[PDB]
């Protein structure tokens, strides 16, 4: 009764956004994984019903071993969150009526997840009941048990869980932030986790990483499997890919949203 019913937040992964990109027409990184979900939604739904917003953020992951003129993973992640919650805050003040759908990939997935954690625990920026569902792809913070385990996921946890102790990483600009406090809270039943068999970001074994081997650790952390969530080669649920599934999921959620 005034403005767009439901806002869909899409957060791209590392090297798949810039602060300069169109929030409503992501264009700079055509290959961006989250575009395969957000674009189809935008054209399939009217402006009255659905607004799809993809976060324009730096989406970088500096590696000190190359001379990256990149932003550190820490701030980048930090910026991406500021940008997204402000987008969420504003749409809420303009439209206190509006419901939300949130989805993210790699870096975007840890940002999206951190947000779900907060909303789920009454920490804002929005009330729990206004979020329809969340889906995180290749979340470096994944823990088994917390959030819904969708598909042929490997049992395991994100690199930010298994490398939580490791101190150098933090000093080096990319802190492994460990488990999310209070989990996804009241959102735990609606927050979905997708992770590819062999993806070291969201399925990290102790044996995979070494301190004696830090360049290769940062490469791995910064970003085939990772490349290919839009094929049914490693993860497929009931006939579709991680992209096709999470589209279907949202397309359907938007239909069922309430009409103010």
By annotation, the residues acting in catalysis are 106, 199, 226
Tokens 């910064």 locate to 222
- The closest alpha carbon to 138, from 122, 153, 128, 127, belongs to 153
184 within 8 A of 117, measured Cβ to Cβ: yes
Phi, psi angles (nearest 5°) of residue 136: -115, 125
CA distance 260 to 253: 16
CA distance 3 to 254: 15
- The closest alpha carbon to 121, from 68, 187, 166, belongs to 187
The neighbour count for residue 128, using CB atoms within 10 Å, is 14
């Amino acid at each position: 009764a005034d403005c767009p019913d439901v806002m869909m937040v899409s957060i791209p992964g590392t090297w798949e956004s810039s602060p300069t990109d169109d929030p409503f027409n992501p264009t700079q990184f055509p290959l961006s994984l989250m575009s395969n979900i957000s674009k189809p939604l935008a054209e399939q739904f009217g402006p009255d019903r659905l607004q799809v917003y993809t976060t324009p953020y730096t989406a970088q992951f500096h590696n000190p071993f190359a001379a990256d003129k990149q932003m550190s993973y820490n701030d980048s992640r930090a910026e991406g969150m500021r940008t997204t919650v402000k987008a969420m805050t504003d749409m809420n003040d303009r439209c206190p009526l509006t419901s939300y759908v949130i989805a993210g990939f790699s870096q975007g997935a840890v940002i999206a997840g951190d947000i779900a954690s907060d909303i789920g625990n009454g920490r804002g920026p929005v009330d729990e009941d206004l979020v329809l569902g969340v889906t995180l792809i290749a979340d470096g913070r994944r823990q088994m048990g917390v959030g819904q385990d969708v598909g042929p996921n490997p049992a395991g946890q994100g690199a930010e869980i298994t490398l939580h102790e490791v101190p150098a990483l933090s000093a080096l600009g990319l802190t492994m932030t460990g488990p999310r406090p209070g989990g996804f809270g009241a959102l735990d039943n609606r927050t979905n986790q997708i992770c590819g068999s062999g993806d070291l970001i969201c399925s990290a074994p102790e044996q995979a990483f070494s301190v004696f081997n830090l360049p290769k650790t940062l490469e791995t952390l910064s970003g085939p499997v990772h490349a290919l969530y839009n094929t049914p080669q490693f993860w497929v649920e009931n006939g579709q890919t991680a992209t096709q599934w999470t589209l279907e999921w949202a397309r359907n959620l938007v239909e069922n949203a309430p009409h103010p």
